[PDB]
Write a new protein. Structure first.
Lengths: 474, 474, 474
């Protein structure tokens, strides 16, 4: 990248210490620029969900892939579970979202636990495939948590067939007291759900599709065991991207695993990490990987920076690894340290093909973790790190390792009471990246890398401006 | 009853204004006295659970009937639901309690919502009828609320066949880290659960059984509609006692309903209410009822005392109605106003055959209401009154009545963190009644009525002594 | 009245110390009993709004008279103001309520200050008489308080002509997101507003009408000055009842004023007060008054009980004055001390023709005082007493009296966040009185006096039962 004249700091910079100065801009609207990545991951937006078990899940995978991102399935899960997740994700529609389906035979608790699994805010109830009503939080607040759901269904809900123009759906939901509309198949069976905000998004975003036209999804494995067999098994079942993720990516085991996956000629683009050095990035590229994950240490749940002096400020690491990868035709991802949309924009301008986002997304409805309400009754979720799952390999055997593996750190990730959905932070991040592109004047992401000019700011320089409202950022 | 010389107050007395003075006592241990009632309800202890939908339920019915009480099924429930409740209650064992059964296919939320449905504190998991482990609160605290239960089962649990002496079970649970022991059938199938405290109680209490030997249960109906048909339907399905419960028991509709049930010659003893007058009690006895419920107004959720000057201090009402009923060979129950075991003892000495307890029991695990945790994270349940269900009889039709029916009052009934089970308040109440009998010197409940001497105390006289600890009383 | 045998207390009783015991009841539904008073005031419900400047006003007068009560215009107001109030009150419709009318030329502050002047919760906007939309609190929360109202009008509102059956209106508002429906004249001009709850009430209550068919209203004067001229002036302008109200009603000036008004032969029934003695009541009856107000001292803002030993427990005073008035064919009103509906029921059973309610009603939208929000942001109003206006008669002249007149006491009267309207407390009071009548078994108010049986309870006897929720009672 290009820095301002005289900006040659003697220290490595994180996101807070570096900024972007505007430049020659010819575009006007932020919809003119495109966010499609060129790394081969196929994402039309530069957002990638991390490999954390508290962030990556079925609902988040489907939701993010619908809006143009990709989600990496967490490492160390049964092959059956990840295969089922992939089948569900690629079985969903490209445009209409799937609501929370409940049969009247279910219990009220089965509703109250699922209304917050999606950003819709109101689950749907189906009877032999026919959607007969909606179930909201206000309906289940006063009822026993184990009465039949049929006691809670309300018949005031908007219906529309699949293929309906979102323009009409928006006006239908304009006067509807509930922001949820049921989309039904031409035979009347429930096909999905189209939120008013989701209806608006349907014309803005474009889903990341595979060669068949289904939602893209990524899977991950560790370096322990037969990495080749695990990668081949994940390839058999649906998979659009392979990510080899470890706490330390500059290991001999890392290179051996990359070589093992590359020798299988699966055709899937290969992603590895993490290294915060040009030497590590070029070594991983040479080993056969197509993409190199960068961040080790800036992870919001990563205690390596505190257990050990090992780490690096994220921005400088991304810049160096991006230069190293582009010298060899590879690509890199920024991993961790993503608290604000400015982090996404800064990492993308630093040369990353896209940005891998972790615990920030875990504080949303679509995250696999269950929603909790704190002492002050604010929506939040307890996000936790991968810990030993990123490291190399009886109860005594478990205790021998777990005594010295870094503890599973947990942070209270609060949701924004209004924009609590993952699509809402996707909107924030996409708006930020588009604003950065317009300010720079670049119409596409490689142009965003090429034309950006960066500068160094002090701690007080980070203080100016307006901070984010509650819940929009970690 | 007999009052002290010169104690002729000019005001009606509640429980707080009256006390018991000791007398000639020949018994020493409180196990020497028996608490069996003579009203025909068959309860070996004078505790009866109220007819409130927040107190009476399947679990409370079974638990209280096991320890010698009886529970009245709430009025205005479907015939199928009450029939299923009765079948379950009479299908359970007389000695061993039933634990919370979970299959490994269930979700973690289905456990976490049920561990607090019983006072055991740890649910059991069954696989094809074989109990394979226990599930406690500490196990489910850190796991996602929708993983399979099999991920939570712990194999450290005590096993013992049915018919095992509780003496051995107590010593088995002496060193067991979990206070829950699994009782299994001779073929290995799960038959029930025997808590250490429950094991101790098994030798103290004696269950209230019917003519067949199954747990007794009572059902209730209102005065609206075909009361005779409803009573006959409740008689067809298992039922050990019929309670006609209304907000006002001195009505012509009340007498007509009593006559209708009496003309059916069901044989079941008939209970009616509520009247706080001797004239009302004798009228209800003449109408055909065998038992008259007394309290109207002292109910902890009854807002009639505040909506209207209508009401009465509970103790004087119980004394007068007891005298009226005993003049005619009938029996009476104290209804409402039961906050402390002293209330039970005072009502029983006042002449009531047994005591009908309401919202105090609703603050327990066995109550049908779901357990909630307050702002300070203390276990409590939101108990609510019957409201319009105790009164005589489209959405407009519902709004016409509900606008003027008394609102469903709700109170924050806190559980005691240690003795939160309904059996624990049963132990407190039974210990109090036995202590009252020993202090009076009576070996049986009619002797408790006959030999008791009461006195009147001021508000300051209620201040002396030690108040109950948190959660033991409402 | 009749007390229980042995209930002969040595102290005068307030509402809290006395209760009602049920009796022979033949009626079942509380709509069977009628609440019409026989004192000649014409009120179909026993609720009368006090003479306090913080309670009696145009909106409260119209609202209470619509539901069957009467409101006494405060003493010491200009003749023009009370004449305008009377003309407005008698100019309104008997069934449909009038909403808050706003022209688009008005300011947003003129809306935000008026949305809380009525219990509707959403004002109406008219353009040349045509209602073009509604204005709610949520609409004005985010806008500058001085933009034009036209920027706030929302067109989603239900319309219905006058004479429409409330059955259809209820179903129309069933799915409407706003609880406010606009009632329009057959030519399209705005005629009033029919709230869903108001639509239900329209079939329950019956308005108190004059000989012409317009809403009844009462006016009040002091004893100072030419009381005859003031009464004649109030008679010229519309008036349905004359109330001579003073702090001390057993004065020679009181008798002289009563004689002066009686000599005018206005025909309007005459009400005077206040005396808490049989001698005072009979003296005021002899002086020419038809009704005697009783309470002096129990007033929630009356500091006479604290400045002076002068006063009386309200219930005993009402009983004695009721007996004194009925010995002479007169009638009495309970004045002050009305915190709960039980107070209304107890005073009515004590023999009062109806109940005069004060600061309890001032904590409502319809009260003339402006709504305030406290430190915790809870809706409340600062109710204040009449102070020197109830007593007999330059800045020095003002300071000479005001230094020794009792200070204007002020209390923080909180509204219930849900049922904050005066019609809602009217519903509570009417439901309480009807419940008392049904428990007693009386079908009409003189029968409620005749058939009621009362008893004395201690302070602990007042503790039993459930307290009111927040905001329902003072
Ligand atoms: N009735 C009903 N059950 C559902 C629905 N979605 C999920 N479930 C059930 O709830 C379980 C947990 O839901 P998931 O969201 O898949 O699980 P999770 O661990 O919370 O999150 P993921 O990582 O997305 O799997 C599923 O295995 C189903 O048994 C729904 O819409 N309706
Ligand atoms: N797996 C499992 N499900 C249970 C168990 N007990 C109850 N359930 C289920 O949970 C539902 C609610 O339990 P109940 O306690 O009967 O219902 P409630 O309304 O909370 O209380 P009750 O008044 O006692 O019925 C039942 O209808 C069953 O479907 C148990 O031990 N194991
Ligand atoms: N635009 C508009 N102005 C109103 C409305 N009602 C009252 N006002 C104006 O606001 C003033 C105060 O309203 P009122 O409620 O009559 O006065 P108050 O002193 O608050 O209470 P009252 O004792 O009922 O008179 C009136 O004199 C009118 O000028 C309304 O519906 N629309
Ligand atoms: N070493 C380590 N890294 C973690 C852990 N949990 C998450 N990470 C890293 O941090 C990233 C997410 O960081 P975030 O975007 O939440 O700031 C993950 O993609 C992963 O690279 C953990 O427990 N240990
Ligand atoms: N009028 C009335 N009585 C109630 C209500 N809920 C409970 N009760 C009465 O109060 C009794 C329980 O009182 P507790 O024992 O909780 O003080 C019940 O058995 C019933 O008689 C209600 O909503 N209204
Ligand atoms: N002496 C006196 N009585 C007052 C004052 N304000 C109200 N009152 C009395 O108290 C009554 C209202 O009492 P409430 O119904 O609010 O308890 C009024 O109708 C009036 O009789 C005041 O300032 N002084």
């Amino acid at each position: 990248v290009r820095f301002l004249d005289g900006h040659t700091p003697a220290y490595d910079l994180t996101y807070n210490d570096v900024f972007v100065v505007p430049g020659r801009s010819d575009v006007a609207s932020r919809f003119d620029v495109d966010l499609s990545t060129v790394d081969g991951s196929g994402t039309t937006i530069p957002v990638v969900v991390a490999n954390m078990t508290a962030v990556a899940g079925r609902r988040m995978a489907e939701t993010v892939a619908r809006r143009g991102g990709i989600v990496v399935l967490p490492q160390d899960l049964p092959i059956t579970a990840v295969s089922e997740t992939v089948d569900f994700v690629k079985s969903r529609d490209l445009v209409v979202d799937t609501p929370v389906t409940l049969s009247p035979e279910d219990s009220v608790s089965d509703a109250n636990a699922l209304l917050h699994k999606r950003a819709h805010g109101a689950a749907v109830v189906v009877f032999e495939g026919r959607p007969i009503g909606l179930v909201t939080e206000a309906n289940c607040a006063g009822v026993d948590r184990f009465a039949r759901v049929r006691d809670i269904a309300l018949s005031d809900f908007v219906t529309a067939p699949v293929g309906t123009d979102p323009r009409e759906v928006f006006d239908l939901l304009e006067h509807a007291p509930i922001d949820v509309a049921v989309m039904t198949a031409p035979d009347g069976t429930l096909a999905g759900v189209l939120t008013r905000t989701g209806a608006i998004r349907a014309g803005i975003y474009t889903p990341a599709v595979d060669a068949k036209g289904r939602l893209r999804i990524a899977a991950a494995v560790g370096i322990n065991g037969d990495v080749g067999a695990k990668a081949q098994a994940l390839a058999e079942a649906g998979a659009d991207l392979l990510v080899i993720d470890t706490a330390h990516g500059h290991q001999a085991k890392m290179l051996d695993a990359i070589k093992a996956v590359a020798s299988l000629d699966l055709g899937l683009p290969l992603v590895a990490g993490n290294v915060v050095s040009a030497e590590g990035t070029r070594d991983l590229i040479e080993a056969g990987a197509s993409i190199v994950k960068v961040g080790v240490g800036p992870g919001a749940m990563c205690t390596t920076r505190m257990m050990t002096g090992v780490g690096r400020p994220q921005f400088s690491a991304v810049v160096e690894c991006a230069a190293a990868a582009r010298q060899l035709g590879g690509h890199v991802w920024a991993d961790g340290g993503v608290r604000h949309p400015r982090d996404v924009a800064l990492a993308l301008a630093a040369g990353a093909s896209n940005v891998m986002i972790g615990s920030w997304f875990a504080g949303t409805y679509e995250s696999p973790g269950d929603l909790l309400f704190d002492r002050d009754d604010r929506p939040y979720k307890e996000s936790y790190g991968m810990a030993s799952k990123r490291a190399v390999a009886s109860s005594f055997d478990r205790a021998r390792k777990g005594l010295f593996e870094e503890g599973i750190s947990t942070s209270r990730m609060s949701l924004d009471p209004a924009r609590g959905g993952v699509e809402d932070l996707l909107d924030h991040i996409t708006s930020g990246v588009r604003s950065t592109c317009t300010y720079v004047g670049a119409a596409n992401l490689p142009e965003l890398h090429e034309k950006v000019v960066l500068g160094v700011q002090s701690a007080a320089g980070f203080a100016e401006g307006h901070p984010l409202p509650a819940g929009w950022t970690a």
